């Protein structure tokens, strides 16, 4: 009754296929084959309400066939991952966002940015730069460490919250439009009837 | 589908039992027994629309039982008759109107005044007085001659017109009230929903 679908997009060697497994099975693997592309399902309890999460990790070889994007775009949330040592991954994330914008053709979609593997490795890309990019793009930024299991839950919860906010806004706007049309028609009917009553009373 | 009921009230020797018969059967009688009390039915075509008229002439002996007034008050139109030679009939008409006021308990009822037998007999009561009483009472006044068959049709048509006007006014007022209540409730709902939408938008 309450299911949300999320897609995780990143680059090569930036923590791909290492966050979903840690979130689901609570276990870590040092090496995994990137050729594996699989979907995961898990139930959660967020804000006192149970929910279902489907997670799809973008993997596999380079593909551009129309059937791939036809089977895709079913996602409702998008999480883009990056590390603090790949300007190449920065540019890849920018290009991926630019492409999904036009592919979905929706003005705004639930989008979150995640920085992985920060505590252990050396740190190069400035937090000021990361926050500036996040503020310029208009999407939340979250720092997550895969091996220590911190940040994933809050990032997923915030993405779900964004989805809920968008749905509520759409519903409220539609209802307001309907009520406004109601009011206009009733106003015209009342004006006509009152004018007729006045004209009839004037005769007698 | 369109039936109206009228009651004709007068006094002694003021043309009673002589207008209804002339209207219905198109014939005149010089003498009629006042003890006869009967009801008449007739179809008419007024303003291009067919209608049914039931006519009840107030006759018989003086009766004050509650059963009489229970069988009565079913009338929707009232026609009060008078001549130009009986101040007694004038006072009787005034008293009858005063009594039907409280008997019906309605603020206003379809009421017409008719002056009978005017061309032939000597003329005493002033037309200025008659018109002054009619204007003071707020009811139309019509001059009718029984033997020459003039005025009855127009008097009945005007009474029917008053009935139609009253019905139309009541319907229009009821419809306006219902529409206004609709308007109020819908406006409050719209205000609440718009406030909620603004509050939700302010967060994001």
């Amino acid at each position, epitope marked *: 009754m309450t299911e949300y679908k999320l897609v995780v997009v990143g680059a090569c060697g930036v923590g791909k296929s290492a966050l979903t497994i840690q979130l689901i099975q609570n276990h870590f693997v040092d090496e995994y084959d990137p050729t594996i592309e699989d979907s995961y399902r898990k139930q959660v309890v967020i804000d006192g309400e149970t929910c279902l999460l489907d997670i799809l990790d973008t993997a596999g070889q380079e593909e551009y066939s129309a059937m791939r994007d036809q089977y895709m775009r079913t996602g409702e949330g998008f999480l883009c991952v990056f590390a603090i040592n790949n300007t190449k991954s920065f540019e890849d994330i920018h290009h991926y966002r630019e492409q999904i914008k036009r592919v979905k053709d929706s003005e705004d979609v639930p989008m979150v940015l995640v920085g992985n593997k920060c505590d252990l490795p050396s740190r190069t890309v400035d937090t000021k730069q990361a926050q500036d990019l996040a503020r310029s793009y208009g999407i939340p930024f979250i720092e997550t460490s895969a091996k220590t299991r911190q940040g994933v839950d809050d990032a997923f919860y915030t993405l779900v919250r964004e989805i809920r906010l968008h749905k509520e806004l759409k519903q409220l706007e539609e209802e307001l439009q309907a009520i406004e049309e109601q009011l206009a*028609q009733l*106003q015209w009917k009342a004006q006509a009837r009152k004018e007729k009553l006045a004209q009839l009373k004037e005769k007698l | 589908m369109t039936e109206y009921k009228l009651v004709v009230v007068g006094a002694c020797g003021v043309g009673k039992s002589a207008l209804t018969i002339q209207l219905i059967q198109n014939h005149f009688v010089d003498e009629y027994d006042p003890t006869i009390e009967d009801s008449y039915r007739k179809q008419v075509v007024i303003d291009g629309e067919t209608c049914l008229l039931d006519i009840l002439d107030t006759a018989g002996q003086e009766e004050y039982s509650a059963m009489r007034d229970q069988y009565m008050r079913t009338g929707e139109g009232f026609l009060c008759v008078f001549a130009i030679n009986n101040t007694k009939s004038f006072e009787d008409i005034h008293h009858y109107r005063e009594q039907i006021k409280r008997v019906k308990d309605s603020e206003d009822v379809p009421m017409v005044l008719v002056g009978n037998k005017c061309d032939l007999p000597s003329r005493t009561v002033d037309t200025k007085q008659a018109q002054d009483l009619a204007r003071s009472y707020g009811i139309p006044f019509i001059e009718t001659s029984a033997k020459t068959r003039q005025g009855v049709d127009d008097a009945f048509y005007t009474l029917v017109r008053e009935i139609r006007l009253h019905k139309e006014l009541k319907q229009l007022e009821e419809e306006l009230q219902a529409i206004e209540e609709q308007l109020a409730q819908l406006q409050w709902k719209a205000q609440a929903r718009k406030e909620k939408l603004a509050q939700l938008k302010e967060k994001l």
Partner: nanobody
Amino acid sequence: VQLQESGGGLVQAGDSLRLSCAASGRTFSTYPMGWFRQAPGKEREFVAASSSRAYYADSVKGRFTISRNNAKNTVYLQMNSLKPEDTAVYYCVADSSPYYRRYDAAQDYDYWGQGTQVTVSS
């Protein structure tokens, strides 16, 4: 309570026609009016309506004209640049309920007329 129609017939393609629907029952100045159409073997489709603002169908937009005169309670439909695919039967409709009724709903109106035939040759 009664509506009368005039102007139907058979004409050629590309000409212009003008049809009239008059309400002769009683006062209809507080009653919205409109037009519906039906082809042989098809379903009812709303064409135009008179309300607070003019409402039009998607398939005939930009060509038809609807006029209302409250002096005699008449509604006129003027059609120009006519296409041959409009040969059908047209009905005049009116509304009387005080509560809200959908304008594009065929089942929300309560007063109907006899209807007229419009035919266009090749």
